[PDB]
């Protein structure tokens, strides 16, 4: 064992840690007193009307039905 | 993950191992005992084998 040269570039790029944003799970805010929920819920009955459908670009992604929900409206 | 243990060791040398010391080289497979030749030697008396002739 002489040494390790690591001809590959410096590739220790350990990913993010689910970067800490501010408080989350915003439905919406109104006054006196009604509040409804955007980020339309998944149609799968296995999700108890609590999951948030991640819609990045022209597609929406589920979190509890880990990946199976794909519909564009 | 699905790449940690994917490649098969269902046959060949990697399939079997010493039941006593988890080695691969120098093993007895006959009668289904699966003890390597160094481990089978020391427990030859206990297993029931002996040097008759």
């Amino acid at each position: 064992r002489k040494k390790k040269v690591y001809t590959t570039p410096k590739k220790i790029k350990h990913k993010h840690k689910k970067v800490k944003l501010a408080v989350l799970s915003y439905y919406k805010v109104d006054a006196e007193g009604k509040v409804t929920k955007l980020r339309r819920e998944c149609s799968n009955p296995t999700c108890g009307a609590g999951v948030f459908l991640a819609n990045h670009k022209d597609r929406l992604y589920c979190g509890k039905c880990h990946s199976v929900y794909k519909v564009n409206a | 993950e699905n790449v940690w243990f994917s490649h098969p060791r269902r046959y060949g040398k990697g399939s079997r191992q010493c039941r006593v010391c988890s080695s691969h080289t120098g093993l007895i497979r006959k009668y289904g005992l699966n003890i390597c030749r160094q481990c089978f030697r020391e427990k030859a008396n206990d297993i029931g084998f002996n040097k008759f002739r």
Binding site: - | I28, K30, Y31, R37, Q38, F40, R41, A44, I47, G48, F49, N50, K51, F52, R53
Partner: protein, 100 residues
């Protein structure tokens, strides 16, 4: 009924006791029996190089162990077969009873 006994221990001097003890039980009970038949000693051989290494003179010694089998045929009613299958038990001695 045609019950059959089988003994497959590895110790003749221990195994000949059980065979002797079972033949005398039926004989003193006045039941016709088929005498104890002793199968050839089937030999399990394992041969290995003595050394754990690969060097030195190639010495190849064998370890042998012998299996001694006996089987006896009886014709006995159900009442006495129950009391003879649960007796004549010895360490390292295996017995199996089959009816017909």
């Amino acid at each position: 009924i045609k019950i059959r006994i089988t003994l497959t221990s590895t110790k003749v001097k221990q195994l000949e006791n059980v065979s002797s003890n079972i033949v005398k039980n039926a004989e003193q009970h006045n039941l016709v029996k088929k005498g104890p038949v002793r199968l050839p000693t089937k030999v399990l051989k394992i041969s290995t190089r003595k050394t754990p290494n690969g060097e030195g003179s190639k010495t190849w010694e064998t370890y042998e162990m012998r299996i001694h089998k006996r089987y006896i045929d009886l014709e006995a009613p159900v009442q006495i077969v129950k009391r003879i299958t649960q007796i004549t038990i010895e360490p390292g001695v295996d017995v199996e009873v089959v009816v017909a």
